[PDB]
Paper text:
As a member of the Embecovirus, [name] uses a primary glycan-based receptor (9-O-acetylated sialosides) and a secondary proteinaceous receptor for host cell targeting and membrane fusion. One unique feature of [name] spike is that the C-terminal domain (CTD) of S1 (also known as receptor-binding domain, [name]) is exceptionally larger than other CoV RBDs, and the receptor-binding motif (RBM) of [name] adopts a unique fold. Proteinaceous receptor of [name] was identified as transmembrane serine protease 2 ([name]) and [name] [name] binds [name] with nanomolar affinity. The [name]–[name] interaction occurred between a groove formed on the [name] [name] apex and a hydrophobic surface near the active site in the C-terminal trypsin-like serine peptidase (SP) domain of [name].
To investigate whether the binding mode of [name] with 1A-[name] and 1B-[name], and the regions involved in the [name]–[name] interaction are similar, we superimposed two structures, giving an overall RMSD (Cα atoms) value of 1.3 Å. Further, we compared the structures of interaction regions in 1 A and 1B [name] that directly contact [name], which gave an RMSD of 0.9 Å, confirming that this region adopts a similar fold despite amino acid variances between [name] 1 A and 1B. Except four residues on apex of β-hairpin (residues 509–512) which have minor shifts, all other interaction residues are nearly superimposable. Variations D511Y and H512V between 1A and 1B [name] may alter hydrophobic packing interaction; variations S487K and T507D between 1A and 1B [name] may affect salt bridging contacts, which on the whole results in different receptor binding affinity.
Author numbering:
A (entry chain A): 322 to 610
B (entry chain B): 129 to 492
Write the structure that this text describes.
Amino acid sequence: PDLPDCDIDKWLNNFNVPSPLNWERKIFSNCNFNLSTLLRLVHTDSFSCNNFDESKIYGSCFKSIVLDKFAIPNSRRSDLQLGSSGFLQSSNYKIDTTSSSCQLYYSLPAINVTINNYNPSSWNRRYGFNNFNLSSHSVVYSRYCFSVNNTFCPCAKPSFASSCKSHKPPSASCPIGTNYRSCESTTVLDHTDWCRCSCLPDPITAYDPRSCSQKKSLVGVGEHCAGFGVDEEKCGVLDGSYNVSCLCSTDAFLGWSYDTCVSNNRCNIFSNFILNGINSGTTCSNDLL
Amino acid sequence: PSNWCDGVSHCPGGEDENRCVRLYGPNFILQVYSSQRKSWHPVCQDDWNENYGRAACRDMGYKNNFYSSQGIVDDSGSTSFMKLNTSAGNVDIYKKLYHSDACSSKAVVSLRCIACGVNLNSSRQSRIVGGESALPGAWPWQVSLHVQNVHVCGGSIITPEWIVTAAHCVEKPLNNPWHWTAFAGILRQSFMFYGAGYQVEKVISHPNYDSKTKNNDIALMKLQKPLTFNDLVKPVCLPNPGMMLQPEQLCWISGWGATEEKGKTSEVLNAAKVLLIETQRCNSRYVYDNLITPAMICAGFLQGNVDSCQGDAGGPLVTSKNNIWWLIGDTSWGSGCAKAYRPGVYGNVMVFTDWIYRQMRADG
């Protein structure tokens, strides 16, 4: 009634489609929507609702509709089943099973869609990461996520490393207010300056997690990935003084891979529908008179 | 000693190469070195009596000890077997052996020169760091060696007369057997005081032992009085070449070591389960930077919290296989106690199994 349309269809078919690492989310409110028009305008593969009725969606009023979208890899299609523990569900996006939700399977042609990859972790971009140097129509997904606090450094103290004859790690200067990397020195069998540090191999391959500063984490409902591997033995350069900055190279970041989204010259994108306030609100539906 | 089993005849009679004998496999299949083909071949059960087993165990550095001997089905896949003959009037077994394609009984000899590798049943024993109390009788081969009536290094027995341990404990000026005193079969260190000692008559050290890299770390203490075997003191069988020691295999370590680094030694004997670490995994630039010689073994957990300590040196590294315990490692040294990335480092007994026999026969 004297109030415009939701234009949900215009948002899903946008040529800019993000990745499960950086899945977007838009909130629809106080607008008119049509699921039948959405069904015919966009080529939808599957449409299943969890703990909800498909027939009651038509001509129903809600409070707000929460949407998600990200192009899906071909390898981890099996991760989207409810209750799974795949890479996408344990590190990229966890589906709200309790709430009344509907899962949308829609696709766009590959001749116009442009994929976007972004790193949501703050400390990931702080310590060297810039962007993803990936191919066209490439979807970046995270194997695991590591959660660190504000006082974490991947670079050791240069003063400590000045006396490490053997296995001297690359060193640099932390930003002020942060705590330096944990390291210790011993000596075994004529290795008078033997030096070892925590999280020495890849943090997934790190045998002792308690002494490791990086802690693995599970993604929740609405949260994003905590971080990457960010191997510390490649962060910085050798014989680095305080004039250099604690920066990790591109190859230091681990715990992620990629796969394409094409399927019969058509890129597939997963969408999740969350409905709030059934038989309430003002964003009603005009599927029935 | 070192002239034994080297492929070169030293004595004019050639007993060095004709009498090279060793066991094989977890089922103790006997082998005899063939000088004509420079290879080890098993023996047949055909026309064999226990009097020959007496001589076999005598030449195997076990003197008159002889537990049992029976025939078993061949499992090593050997193409040739030694065959005995009763037509010869001589009393030496090795001149009676000749090559044959197969035995008529389709069996090979399982030789046991000493009753070893068996202990009383024990349920809960993880007394090394992070565990619960132990029970007597589960580790009867474990003994403690004392200098001035205080503990220095542990020890394990293989015969009533011999005790094996690490060479760094017997290093100079502690190379005199008069200072050493061994106690056998006592769990509490407060009880090995009054008359329980077994003095060492002569200490044996590895000729190629080097203290800079602490490699070839082996030592053999010999007592004047042979140990009288009972339930509380039993030997452990020396492992044989040819066992497929799988990675991660559940092994047991024991000793009177400390519960933490730089701490005092434990009042009671401690023993807990650890796991094998592959040598190529350990000698990388990461774990010890090529510090592990082929005569060295890495055992324990890379995550730590279960490892040897000071005072655990000389202890046994034992595993269970076919209800028989095998002394595969000796505690040489350990970088820290119960710590990650720096597990326990053990000396490889398997490389020195023949050297032990070389010292056994010449000191019989």
